[PDB]
Amino acid sequence: LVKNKCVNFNFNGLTGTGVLTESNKKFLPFQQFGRDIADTTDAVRDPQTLEILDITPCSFGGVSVITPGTNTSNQVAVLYQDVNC
Amino acid sequence: QKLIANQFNSAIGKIQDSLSSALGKLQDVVNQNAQALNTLVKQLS
């Protein structure tokens, strides 16, 4: 198991892509993975060590270019629209 | 002037009680936009 970086994963056949992290969720002993209000997986129980993991996506939206206008200058700034640098 | 000021000061107190006891026009815009999004997500399956 590797955590805090984007990976493909498969736990016991439950398959996906995302950043796995340690979790505060408390599954009952028979429950094996968790879902949100939109019915998509967001948590999983590790089959080896029975600890709870969160899942989070890897797809992060716009890149936007900020310009003085080319009449004024050719230098620019760039916005990564939802990213922690 | 004193009567008119008292009526005004009294009337503001009623607004505060009414709001602390609705905003349906705003709330149902938020609800409509959440419904459209959850419906978009449901269409994937």
């Binding site: 949100d36 939109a38 989070t56 797809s59 939206g61 629209q81 939802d82 | 609705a22 997500v41």
Partner: peptide
């Protein structure tokens, strides 16, 4: 502000308003 009251997987995103609530 008290009285009035996540799908990131699917390419859905929410953009901040230009003005913040403190500006309004």
């Amino acid at each position: 502000f008290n009285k009035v009251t996540a799908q990131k997987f699917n390419g859905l995103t929410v953009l901040p308003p230009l003005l913040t609530d403190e500006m309004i």
